[PDB]
From a paper:
After deducing the symmetry of the pilus from two-dimensional class averages of single filaments, we performed helical reconstruction and obtained a 3.5 Å-resolution cryo-EM density, from which an atomic model of the CupE pilus could be built. The atomic model reveals an arrangement of CupE1 subunits in a zigzag architecture (215° right-handed rotation per subunit). In agreement with classical CUP proteins, the N-terminal β1-strand of each (n+1)th subunit completes the Ig-like fold of the nth subunit. This donor strand interacts with the nth subunit through both β-sheet hydrogen bonding as well as hydrophobic interactions, filling a hydrophobic groove in the subunit core. The structure also shows two key cysteine residues (C41-C85) forming a disulfide bridge within a β-sheet from which the donor strand extends. The 13-residue donor strand of the (n+1)th subunit represents the majority of the interaction with the nth subunit. The interface between the Ig-like domains is relatively small in comparison to the extensive donor-strand interactions, and is mainly maintained by the interaction of a loop with the next subunit, with two interacting valine residues V69 and V48 at the core of the interaction. Thus, the CupE pilus shows a relaxed arrangement of subunits compared to the tight packing of the Csu pilus, resulting in a higher rise per subunit than in the Csu pilus. Visual inspection of the CupE pilus along the helical axis showed a serine and threonine-rich loop (TTTTSST) extending outward from the helical axis of the CupE pilus, constituting the part of the subunit that is most exposed to the environment. In the EM map, we noticed extra density near the loop that could not be attributed to the atomic model of the CupE1 protein subunit and that we suspected might correspond to a post-translational modification.
Numbering used by the authors:
A (entry chain E), B (entry chain D), C (entry chain A), D (entry chain B), E (entry chain C): 24 to 182
């Protein structure tokens, strides 16, 4: 009863880069390592960790200029704007954690808020600005149960 | 030595619609936007893009009922049933890409094969079901040369 | 008061043909199909159609040699040399349309102007050179009212 | 053995005319043109023709008043009151045809039946009311053989 | 101075007939109808007429056997052996005409030359063998003036 004809056209340009390195892809998921905090018990001291994946650390290796933006989604298990970790065995146990955009862990990254990380330019393959820290305050009870707590984020680089 | 007389008669009906919106026409070509993947270098991560044209995204705004059919022709530079992109400067460089009929990019669109996209009905001006993805597997060498790769399709809506 | 006697004589020759096929005749009208554009609403994209009648497409199947001439009369509802379509319900609504003598729709057919379509010779039953196109420019208001717009032509083949 | 004497007396009057024009005479036959239908093959569409002879069309140019009568004899090859055409090579092949007294071809002329064509008066040299049409119904088989079919009539004008 | 005496004797026999019918007599003139050609203007087509008088056509109704002879005198206005017609108003205008002894108008009747019309025998009241035809060749100028052209013959039947 009708018919419309049109052409779309597809264009892609190779040039200015700023693409992540040392990140494996399985099925288009585009995984970018893991924030491995390590093994501890009865957390009463601050623990620091950085995004490490398989062989080598995740790096940026951005292009000259091109001030980018980093956006980190809240975790699957979130409440009150603070990302959480939930055990795979017991649903009640939970550990809170924070994430920072600098090595000194002074600038906090908020959920769904872009961060102007413009210092990763000029190549040089600098480490990705994503550092986590667990502080033993407000961590429900100081001593949690046993398990393997896990959580996943969603990191977006726009430029 | 001869003469034949006859009348043809031309009929057009306005009513049930299901016509594309936000698509400019120049000379009867009836262009429908562009699949702009963006700028990258040394493609090693999956890149997603959607059909965007000038001011606003391409939409359908189909009519009630009228289960339509979407057919996408293979590109000008094709081999083995997979659409390709070819540089305007160097003929050797090529990047493969795929196209999907859903946002999740789970249903693949084959060349010259109709797709029963019946969920775009009831108006509401839903986005056109045409999404592309570039996966860094089988992309000849992982790092291509520089240029502005281009390709054009031929989208047909029958209903 | 007077009387004159004379003989006229009637002659018809069967031989060189070049006669239309797939065209029904009712009462000597000698109908030759219909230019069915289809169903649309708020025409903003170019629509193409070809002369189709009942079971099969209208064809020529002309004879060897015999360079013919195609003449298309202006429609019943015409103004300024451009053929129009008028609704059967509301007299004000009108859609303009054009007609072409080739598949590419590059050569326009003017009213009461013969066209030397000499490429339809050597039999082979080629499709009749009559293609229509509706372009959404100068179409009064872009969105018309509802109805079943109709128009009739008068196609003459002389050779 | 006998002898009778008498005078006959011959009278002719010049005045009111209504005499045919553009008609050559050879030996008193008083020919009045030809109904040339043209060249066709596999007649499936209606063909129209008018009485044309040598340089110009046959005309009447009748006198004021003087309501005349037109009588057309049946052809040499006739059967069932319908005039026929017979090939000069094969006797079996035959095409039927009709004749009309008006341009619209709505009033049929019957064999040996006068027609009151009173509208050809007031001079003005109007075209002779004799039009033929071949309709592809009841034409034996739709496709005839090759040849030059011919037939002759006998037109009488009485007034 | 003298005187002679003698008897003549008058004899008439009734029997074998072959006498004309449908012919009025006024004063011994013994008129036999009229060759009424009719009314025409600008004679360019052959005109035929037969000897008709008052109520009915002139007939012979001859007797059995008795091969008769028909002799037709030249007209009052004759020149070169061809009978002519002269207007009663203008003496210059003239139309030539011929006369024939058969219906087909193939056998010409010459002035003062007997014709052996032996086929009118056996009664049956056959039409008189006298037919006239006007041919538009050598008729001075093709278009004559107005008037009522007349001429009289002298028909003799000897047997």
């Amino acid at each position: 009863a009708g018919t419309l004809i049109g052409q779309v056209g597809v264009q892609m340009v190779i040039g200015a880069g700023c693409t992540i390195i040392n990140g494996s892809v399985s099925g288009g998921i585009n995984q970018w390592g893991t924030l491995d905090f390590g093994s501890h018990s009865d957390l009463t001291n601050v623990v620091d960790a950085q995004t490490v994946g398989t062989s080598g650390n995740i790096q940026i290796q951005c292009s000259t200029g091109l001030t980018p933006s980093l956006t980190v989604n809240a975790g699957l298990h979130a409440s009150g704007g603070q990302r959480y970790m939930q055990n795979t065995t017991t649903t009640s146990s939970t550990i809170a954690y924070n994430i920072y955009s600098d090595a000194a862990r002074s600038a906090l990254i908020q959920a769904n808020t872009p961060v102007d990380i413009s210092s990763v330019s000029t190549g040089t393959a600098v480490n990705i600005p994503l550092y986590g820290r667990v502080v033993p305050t407000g961590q429900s009870t100081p001593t949690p149960t046993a398990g393997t707590y896990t959580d996943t984020l969603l990191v977006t680089i726009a430029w």
